[PDB]
Amino acid sequence: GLAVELKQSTAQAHEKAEHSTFMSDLLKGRLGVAEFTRLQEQAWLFYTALEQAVDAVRASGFAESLLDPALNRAEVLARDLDKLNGSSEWRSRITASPAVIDYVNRLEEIRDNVDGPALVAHHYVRYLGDLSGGQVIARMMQRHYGVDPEALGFYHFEGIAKLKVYKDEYREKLNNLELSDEQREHLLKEATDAFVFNHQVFADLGKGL
């Protein structure tokens, strides 16, 4: 079904997205808490846009059960950034990198077109990715950079008690979405584009490191 097709269709762009120099250096302990903070600032920008798009598509009544508000990350990230930066200064300072501008532009287009299939593709890449692999990154930020666990709220889903079951039921929801061939093809293409945007985010973050 769709969950399997998504993995197959996106394999090349996904593989490339997981092999950025920025993330390699970050996870091996070669950077610092500052670079982790820059990553989270850029993520706050695109999660904010993503969640506006999710809100629009949810309100239209498309894929409602999938679009669980308990997954919302923007406010959690803001709280992490408050702690990481030590003040609210970051809200006035931070601005989107060129990749994030493109990523946000696309998410805003999806919002305005209330494009359900394309939104689901973005939801998969971010949230199922976060559910699947967030605890590895969190552990590495503590091990390498001494990040306070209270400043890693992004990597914990308070609303979710059974994580393994949740991920299974998430994939099953994907499998059970009613999609025409046009909608399915649109979604699959969008998923590759989403991995690409994310790769480019890392590329920008790694400049001058």
Ligand code: NA
């Ligand atoms: Na699972």
